[PDB]
From a paper:
A common type of LCC in hardwood is the ester-LCC formed between α-1,2-linked 4-O-methyl-d-glucuronoyl moieties of acetylated glucuronoxylan and γ-alcohols in lignin. It was recently discovered that an insoluble hardwood lignin-preparation (LRP) is amenable to enzymatic hydrolysis by a glucuronoyl esterase (GE, EC 3.1.1.B11) releasing aldouronic acids. WT CuGE has a modular architecture with a N-terminal carbohydrate-binding module 1 (CBM1) domain connected to the catalytic domain by a proline-rich linker region. The overall fold of the catalytic domain of CuGE features a large ten-stranded twisted β-sheet flanked by α-helical elements and a surface-exposed active site. The structure complies with the characteristics of a serine esterase belonging to the α/β-hydrolase superfamily.
The aldouronic acid ligands dock onto the surface of CuGE in all the complexes: dΔS270A:Um4X, dΔS270A:Um4XX-OH and dΔS270A:XUm4XX-OH without any major conformational changes of the slightly twisted, branched oligosaccharide. Structures of ligand-bound complexes showed that the ligands bind in the highly accessible and solvent exposed binding site of molecule B only. The α-1,2-linked 4-O-methyl-d-glucuronoyl moiety is nested in the small substrate-binding pocket, that provides distinct recognition of all hydroxyl groups and a hydrophobic environment for accommodation of the 4-O-methyl-d-glucuronoyl substituent, while the xylan-backbone runs along the surface and displays only hydrophobic, van der Waals and water-mediated interactions with the protein. Thus, the oxyanion hole is created solely by R271 with both the backbone amide and guanidinium side chain nitrogen atoms forming close contacts with the O6 carbonyl of the 4-O-methyl-glucuronoyl moiety (3.2 and 2.8 Å, respectively), mimicking the interactions in a tetrahedral reaction intermediate. In the complex formed at pH 7.5–8 (dΔS270A:U4mX), Y366 moves “out” upon substrate binding, and no significant differences are observed in substrate recognition interactions compared to the complexes formed at pH 5.5 (dΔS270A:Um4XX-OH and dΔS270A:XUm4XX-OH). MST measurements of ΔWT and dΔS270A respectively on aldotetrauronic acid (Um4XX-OH) indicate equilibrium dissociation constants in the mM range with a moderately stronger binding (one order of magnitude) between dΔS270A and Um4XX-OH compared to the active variant. The strong binding in dΔS270A:Um4XX-OH is in accordance with the well-defined binding observed in the complexes of CuGE.
Author numbering: 80 to 458
Write the structure that this text describes.
């Protein structure tokens, strides 16, 4: 129904941010339904240029569940048609007592996350580093995911992490005795795990609420804006450095980090893949490594997609200073809880959150230099 999905745009060359509202073939988006097809195209482009191949659900996915006290263990097996299998067993921390009729809402927290989780929400601890190692460039192709698909599989570590989240949600769908409301699943992570959580929410449509925390470069920052920051003297993480530091991106991305204008996506399109579902990301201006201006401009550009879909308040951004990396400032708890309350707890909470302190160091944000499109009202 979307036709043949384009996965490359060989002639692309755009120093500003790619236009969310124009397909690779030059067709303009017009309807809300068009966004589903555009999202599928962005997925293919992101896989091709920076994330590697995200495998589909494998033929074998088995799950069993057991509970001791308030801790559940979800034992998952995943297997291919060639008989290869891997296994992993995330745990779930439950609120006590009788659950809601449809089960507990749940946040999948990469290695526990760094946000406070309200008392009526269960927490699943996902050991993403075991699914795909992330110590340094030395970690390439190591982790459970690669014991299934092969150490030379093109998936980045973050794409392998997404795959694991998808198997977790498969297992939850198969395991009603885990007492989870599978329509009310969120995801969160901080720092490198916040890069991971954004990827999970973008690519796995069953996630109702995505919460990336101080994800920086390769998260809710854009590659093109971070290149501008580093060229003008801010000591930011950028595309060139990040592919040498770790294995969060595919080896193919190495071919583009010096040629960012030729990449027909940026992370504003990655973030927009969450639409029309909900996301709020949190940033910290104390660390220029995180590329503060790039995150504000990137999420401002991503925001236009929700605006065009008539659901601006489903996308939040809050950027402040004055606290340590991955420490949670109580000043932002109301904004976090507004999104959890609305999108996971079914409350009538307002979620209009889009704020920065503009503390961007040696650069400023100038929307007209980066965002070239007007926002259409998709019909
Ligand atoms: O050593 C790296 C190579 O492994 C990488 O190879 C790319 C992998 O994905 C394919 O789609 C590309 O065609 C191929 O070039 O190139 C970069 C290099 O650093
Ligand atoms: C352009 O590409 C999109 C996405 O694949 C597709 O939905 C649309 O039909 C294409 N346009 C034409 C004229 O085929």
């Amino acid at each position: 129904a979307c036709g043949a999905i384009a996965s490359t745009v060989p002639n692309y060359n755009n120093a500003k941010l790619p236009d969310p509202f124009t397909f690779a073939n030059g067709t303009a988006l017009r309807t809300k339904a068009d966004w589903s097809c555009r999202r599928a195209e962005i997925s293919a482009l992101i896989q091709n240029y920076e994330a590697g191949t995200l495998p589909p659900k494998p033929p074998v996915v088995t799950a069993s569940f057991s509970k001791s006290g308030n801790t559940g263990t979800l034992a998952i097996t995943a297997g291919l048609s060639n008989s290869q299998t891997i296994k992993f067993s995330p745990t779930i921390s439950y609120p006590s007592g009788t659950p809601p009729a449809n089960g507990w809402p749940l946040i999948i927290a990469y290695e526990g996350g760094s946000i406070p989780i309200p008392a009526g929400v269960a927490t699943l601890t996902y050991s993403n580093s075991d699914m795909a190692q992330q110590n340094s460039a030395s970690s390439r192709g190591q982790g459970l995911f690669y014991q299934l698909y092969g150490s030379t599989h093109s998936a980045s570590a973050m794409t392998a992490w997404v795959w694991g989240v998808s198997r977790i949600i498969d297992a939850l769908e198969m395991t009603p005795t885990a007492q989870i409301n599978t329509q009310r699943i969120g995801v969160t992570g901080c720092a490198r795990d916040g890069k991971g959580a954004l990827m999970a929410g973008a690519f796995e449509e069953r996630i109702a609420l995505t919460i990336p925390q101080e994800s920086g470069s390769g998260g809710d920052a854009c590659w093109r804006l971070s290149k501008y920051e580093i060229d003008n003297g801010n000591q930011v993480q950028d595309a060139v450095e990040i592919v040498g530091e770790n294995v969060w991106f595919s080896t193919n991305f190495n071919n583009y980090v010096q040629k960012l204008p030729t990449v027909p996506e940026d992370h504003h399109l990655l973030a927009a893949m969450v639409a029309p579902r909900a996301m709020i990301s949190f940033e910290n201006t104390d660390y220029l490594w995180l590329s503060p201006m790039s995150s504000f401009g990137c999420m401002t550009a991503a925001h236009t997609v929700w605006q065009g879909l008539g659901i601006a308040d489903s996308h939040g951004f809050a950027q402040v200073g004055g606290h340590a990396h991955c420490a949670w400032p109580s000043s932002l708890t109301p904004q976090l809880n507004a999104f959890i309350n609305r999108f996971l707890l079914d409350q009538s909470a307002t979620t209009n959150v889009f704020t920065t302190n503009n503390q961007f160091g040696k650069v400023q944000w100038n929307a007209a230099n980066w965002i070239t499109w007007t926002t259409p009202t998709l019909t």
